[PDB]
Amino acid sequence: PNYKLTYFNMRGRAEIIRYIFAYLDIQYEDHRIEQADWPEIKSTLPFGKIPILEVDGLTLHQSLAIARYLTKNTDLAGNTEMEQCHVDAIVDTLDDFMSCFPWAEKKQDVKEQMFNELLTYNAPHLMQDLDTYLGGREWLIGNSVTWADFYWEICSTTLLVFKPDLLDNHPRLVTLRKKVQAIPAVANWIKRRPQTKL
Amino acid sequence: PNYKLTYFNMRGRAEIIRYIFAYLDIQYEDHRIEQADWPEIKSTLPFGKIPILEVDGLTLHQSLAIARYLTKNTDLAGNTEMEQCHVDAIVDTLDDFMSCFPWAEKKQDVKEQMFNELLTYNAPHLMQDLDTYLGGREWLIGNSVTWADFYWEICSTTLLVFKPDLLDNHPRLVTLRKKVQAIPAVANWIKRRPQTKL
Numbered sequence: 001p002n003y004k005l006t007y008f009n010m011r012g013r014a015e016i017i018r019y020i021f022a023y024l025d026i027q028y029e030d031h032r033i034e035q036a037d038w039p040e041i042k043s044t045l046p047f048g049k050i051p052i053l054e055v056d057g058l059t060l061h062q063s064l065a066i067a068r069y070l071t072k073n074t075d076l077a078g079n080t081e082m083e084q085c086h087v088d089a090i091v092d093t094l095d096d097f098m099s100c101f102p103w104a105e106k107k108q109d110v111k112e113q114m115f116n117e118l119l120t121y122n123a124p125h126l127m128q129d130l131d132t133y134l135g136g137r138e139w140l141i142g143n144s145v146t147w148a149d150f151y152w153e154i155c156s157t158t159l160l161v162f163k164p165d166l167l168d169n170h171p172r173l174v175t176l177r178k179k180v181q182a183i184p185a186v187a188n189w190i191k192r193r194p195q196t197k198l
Numbered sequence: 199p200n201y202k203l204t205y206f207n208m209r210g211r212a213e214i215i216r217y218i219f220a221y222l223d224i225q226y227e228d229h230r231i232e233q234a235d236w237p238e239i240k241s242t243l244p245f246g247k248i249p250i251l252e253v254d255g256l257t258l259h260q261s262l263a264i265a266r267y268l269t270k271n272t273d274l275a276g277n278t279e280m281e282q283c284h285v286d287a288i289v290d291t292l293d294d295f296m297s298c299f300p301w302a303e304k305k306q307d308v309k310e311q312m313f314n315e316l317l318t319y320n321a322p323h324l325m326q327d328l329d330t331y332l333g334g335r336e337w338l339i340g341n342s343v344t345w346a347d348f349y350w351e352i353c354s355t356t357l358l359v360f361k362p363d364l365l366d367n368h369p370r371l372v373t374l375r376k377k378v379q380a381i382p383a384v385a386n387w388i389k390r391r392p393q394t395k396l
C-alpha cells in the first residue's frame with residue numbers, strides 16, 4: 001500500500017499520523033507544502049482541509065480518523081473494547097482543547113490575547129484532569145502504550161512551546177512524555193524530523 | 199450491560215448515542231439533569247463534561263468516543279476499516295463545525311450575530327461539500343446506513359432550527375435526513391423522545 005501524507009511543514013495535526021507510521025515501521029511520502037501552494041490543492045479536496053492521506057489512490061481526511069484507521073488491529077489500539085473507548089475519549093479531550101486555539105488568526109494582537117487566555121486560564125485545568133486520570137499508572141490507557149499517549153506527548157510539546165512552566169507541578173505527566181519520547185521508533189523520528197516551531 | 203446515559207434535557211451531544219441505542223435495540227437509562235443537579239455530578243466526573251455513559255458502574259466520556267464504542271462490530275460502524283475511517287472522518291467534520299457555534303454565549307446580540315455569520319458563510323460551504331460527497335448515492339458511506347448518516351440528520355436538525363432554509367438548495371441532503379428519519383427504530387425514537395429546542 002502506497003502512502004502519501006500531505007500537510008503543512010509543521011508537526012501540527014499531521015504529527016500523530018507521522019508517529020504512528022514510525023512506530024509500525026511503515027514507509028510513506030511525507031509531503032509538506034508551502035502556503036503558496038495550498039489554495040490550489042484545497043480547491044480539489046472533498047473537504048478542503050489538511051492533513052489528508054492518500055492510500056492507493058483514495059484520499060482520506062481528518063487527522064484522528066486517519067490515526068484511528070492506521071492503529072486499528074495494532075498494539076497502539078486499546079487492548080479491550082472499553083480501552084479503545086478511553087483511547088478515543090482522551091484523544092478527543094486533548095483535541096477539543098487544541099482546537100480552541102485560533103491557529104489561523106491573522107490579527108496578531110487578537111491571536112496573542114486568545115492564546116494567552118487559553119494557556120493561562122484553561123490549560124492548567126486540563127493538566128490537572130489528565131494528571132488525576134493517569135494517577136500512578138504507566139500509560140494513560142491500560143498496561144501498554146496506545147496512540148493516546150502519542151497524542152498526549154504531541155499536544156503537550158506544542159503547548160510547552162508557548163508555556164514552558166505548564167508541567168512544573170505535574171512530574172507524572174513529564175514522566176509520561178519522556179516514556180513516549182524513549183520508545184525507539186519515536187525517539188528516531190524525533191531526532192530526524194524537520195525542526196519546526198509548531 | 200446496564201447502561202446509564204447522563205446529559206441535559208436536550209438532544210445536543212447525547213442524541214447520537216440515543217439513536218445508536220434505539221437502532222441497535224439496546225436498553226439503557228436515559229437520565230437527564232437540570233442545572234441544579236449539575237455542580238454535584240460535575241465534581242464526580244474526571245473531565246467535568248457531559249454526556250457520560252456508565253456501563254456496569256464504569257464511567258465513559260466524550261460523545262463520539264461512546265457512539266463509536268457502541269457501534270463496534272455492527273454494520274452501523276462501516277463495513278470495512280476504510281469505510282470506518284470515512285465514517286469517522288464525516289463525523290469529526292460535522293462535529294468540528296458544530297463546535298464553532300457559541301452555544302454558551304450570554305450576550306444575546308453577539309450570539310445572534312455569530313450564528314448568522316456561521317449560517318451565512320460557513321454552513322453553505324460545508325453543505326456544498328457534504329452534498330457533492332454524498333452524490334446521488336443512497337448513504338454517506340458504503341451500501342448501508344452508518345452512524346455518520348445519523349450524525350448528519352442530528353446536526354442538520356439542530357442547524358435547521360436557526361436557518362430553516364439551509365437545505366432549500368440541497369434536495370439530496372434533505373432526502374438523506376428523510377431516509378434516516380424513516381428507519382423504524384429511529385422513527386419510533388424521534389416520536390418518543392422529549393421535545394426540546396436543541
Ligand SMILES: N[C@@H](CCC(=O)N[C@@H](CS)C(=O)NCC(=O)O)C(=O)O
Binds near residue numbers: 012013042049062294
Ligand atoms: N479536525 C481537522 C482539522 C483540519 C484542519 O482545520 N487543518 C488546518 C491546518 S491545521 C487547515 O486545513 N487549514 C487550512 C485551511 O483551512 O484552508 C483534522 O484534525 O484534520
Ligand SMILES: N[C@@H](CCC(=O)N[C@@H](CS)C(=O)NCC(=O)O)C(=O)O
Binds near residue numbers: 211247
Ligand atoms: N467534545 C465533547 C464535548 C462535551 C461538552 O462540552 N459537554 C458540554 C455540554 S453540551 C458541557 O459539559 N458543558 C458545560 C460545562 O462544561 O460545564 C463531547 O462531545 O462529549
Ligand SMILES: c1ccc(-c2ncc(-c3cc[nH]n3)s2)cc1
Binds near residue numbers: 098104
Ligand atoms: C493538536 C496538535 C496540534 C495542533 C496544531 N498545531 C499547529 C496548527 C496550525 C498552525 C497554523 N495552522 N494550523 S494546528 C492541533 C491539534
Ligand SMILES: [Mg+2]
Binds near residue numbers: 096290293294
Ligand atoms: Mg473532535
